[PDB]
């Protein structure tokens, strides 16, 4: 089965692009990364940095996770990211997404692997 590490890459890494090209980046990417198979994944973030740069976030600023765990790390620097959010009208299997491109810090939970 897909490891947690493997699933992260799948659902959030997009190192082939410096930023969301168009208003359709999310529609395109949710489908291709397979996030619309049983349902429309309501929200998702794609990060456009190299995987070493994202793995490295795990040796950066330790912060509490949302759920209170203590294995979250915030990047020191802002990163190129694309925010995908399912629209009001999005009805499965015609999953529709609002694409928002921005530079921001990311917080991720890290585990040993």
């Amino acid at each position: 089965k897909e490891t947690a590490a493997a699933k992260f890459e799948r659902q959030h890494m997009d190192s082939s692009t410096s930023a969301a090209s168009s208003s359709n980046y999310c529609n395109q990417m949710m489908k291709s990364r397979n996030l619309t198979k049983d349902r429309c994944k309501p929200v998702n973030t794609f990060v456009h940095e190299s995987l070493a740069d994202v793995q490295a976030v795990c040796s950066q600023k330790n912060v509490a996770c949302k759920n209170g765990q203590t294995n979250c790390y915030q990047s020191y620097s802002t990163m190129s990211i694309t925010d995908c959010r399912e629209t009001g009208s999005s009805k499965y299997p015609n999953c529709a997404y609002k694409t928002t491109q921005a530079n921001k810090h990311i917080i991720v939970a890290c585990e040993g692997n």
Binding site: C58, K104, H105, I107, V108, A109, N113
Partner: peptide
């Protein structure tokens, strides 16, 4: 080492 497993949030 340590790898990212969940995306908690941005900014």
């Amino acid at each position: 080492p340590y790898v990212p497993v969940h995306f908690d949030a941005s900014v």
